[model samples]
Target: MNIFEMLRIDEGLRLKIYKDTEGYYTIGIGHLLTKSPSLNAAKSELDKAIGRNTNGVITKDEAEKLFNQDVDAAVRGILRNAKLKPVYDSLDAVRRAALINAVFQAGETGVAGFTNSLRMLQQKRWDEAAVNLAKSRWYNQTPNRAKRVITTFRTGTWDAYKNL
Candidate 1:
């Protein structure tokens, strides 16, 4: 599947505000509105997309637009990372998408902060990387997402998204 399409399934679209598991105000396609580069601009866009002010509702088109931007950011974020770039370049498309998905949910800094796991992934230690990923605070926070991502990392296949 295309990276964008795959992310849509993993993220699950939304038309209104919903505080995520971490209690952050999110809308559209899992966009963390609070942490956006320009909160006011994003908020304004969402507000207008729904034809109102202060209401976080957004149309599916707008949600997809935001999702694209988020995906773009995550891609660029991975490209810009000194450690991750090399690891990303070494992986297959499926594995790369899994890393991108990880970055999407956790942000470059958060994912990059997983030093040992990153090192294991960098070495192409698939099972080791998957195991290392599981031993994390993030894994506990979003187990289902992490499980699928870890499975992808270990197997380098689309088995994770089959059910979704």
Candidate 2:
């Protein structure tokens, strides 16, 4: 419940396959079907979950399960990156979830592109780190989501964008 709300705000629930903001096939609370290591793998999982070929339709239970997997994938994304794992380890739970939210919204590679900002975050320079995030294209791409992420990082607050 704690981490789920932010992701739900960032990625609204979807029970059918659709294109993401970046044009990749996505479903089930931002689950990227196009990448999944292999699209077939994701499709297979969906098929298995729903007990047949999806044809774009999914049950809430199926979507919820996939959402959970996507969360695991997001966390796994951090551990697999040698440079990021230790950095992930250094943060408090709230900050860690913020980082996961960033990774969830932008992807591991996408978030990893923030070299300067990551350096600032590594130093515990919260304000500067948060400011550096605004310099990226992501800040403009999904303005509100970016704002929430920035607010989380800046203040380490649980409900930084709760009313937004």
Candidate 3:
């Protein structure tokens, strides 16, 4: 099954997002939008912000207060939508999660425009993809974080995603 299916998302939460605006949907625990950073606070904010359960919930008000934007939904959203769809469609859940995890931190446009890495992943060339993944992490705004995520994708282990 695809990662979205495995994670049980409605497949509509993917969209361009920022810190200030409330996102398009709500993603509660047990609903594929695992709370990150301020779990209790996010849940509270989400409950307060939307007044109902939804996925891809984020609020600028919360960002000012909490500053913790959950990356999973954004990552998955990018992977599922637009041109990147085929690449993600071809991946297993673990690999997809790894890629999205990296994107969540890096941002979707970067990943979508990441030509070298996208080429490798689209081809399903794991080894090359890993190499490109590592390289993609290079010279980024957060080089160390990029390297760490690239390493996770290369290692093919999804353990890091446990925190989310």
Candidate 4:
């Protein structure tokens, strides 16, 4: 029903540093980092939220904050990309959220290049869209997450990750 709920189901609630699908130093819920200051800011919030010097470990609360900030930007990036707009507007909230997640993983520029996938989505060919998504290099790198997003796209349900 909401973006945060969707992100929680998809990203899981992590309270520690971990490497994501592309080997970036990620924290919280899929917050990939290319540098510090941002990382340090997140860590500083995590420290405050958990009431201790975590060094960099995140709390669920901190994770939520970071996810809100990051995913908001990622979604906006997807929204502003001309290539994804037609498909993005055609989708329901669930599919839109999945697209946001995909953009988060692949970046707007990266996902924008999936012309066939975007075409399938625009055509409302859910299964074809799923297949198109599955065939991506991103899907090869992140099968499980890709499956969840594809399932969401196909079913038009936020419950796609419930069984996982």
Please, what are the lDDT tens digits per residue for candidate 3 over residues 1-164? Answer: 33343232312232212121223223331222223455555555555645555343544343322212345556657666675677667766667665665454333444444777777877777677766655433435445445545555565564433444
- Per-model TM-score on C-alpha atoms: 0.86, 0.85, 0.46, 0.78
lDDT of 2 by residue, 1-164 (tens): 35677898789989877778877777888877765445566677667656788876788888888889778888898888776787778887888888888888865533546878877877889999988889889888887788888888878786765674
Each candidate: what lDDT? 0.79, 0.78, 0.48, 0.73
* Tens digit per residue, CA lDDT, model 1, 37-130: 5556666756764466755576788778778888899989889988779888989899999989888988453343588887788788989888
Selected candidate, larger lDDT, 2 vs 4: 2
Q: In candidate 3, which residue ranges exceed 4 Å CA deviation?
A: 1-76, 110-113, 136-141, 159-164
Alpha-carbon runs more than 4 Å astray in model 4: 35-54, 109-112
For candidate 1, the clash count comes to 0
Better candidate number, 3 or 4, judged by TM-score: 4
lDDT of 4 at 152: 87
- Cα RMSD of all models vs. native, in order, equals 3.5, 3.3, 10.3, 4.1
Q: What C-alpha lDDT, on a 0 to 100 scale, does residue 86 get in candidate 3?
A: 75
Worst 10 residues of 3 by lDDT: 13-22
Inter-residue clash pairs, candidate 3: 20-60, 25-55, 26-54, 26-55, 27-54, 27-55
Native-referenced Cα lDDT, model 4: 0.73
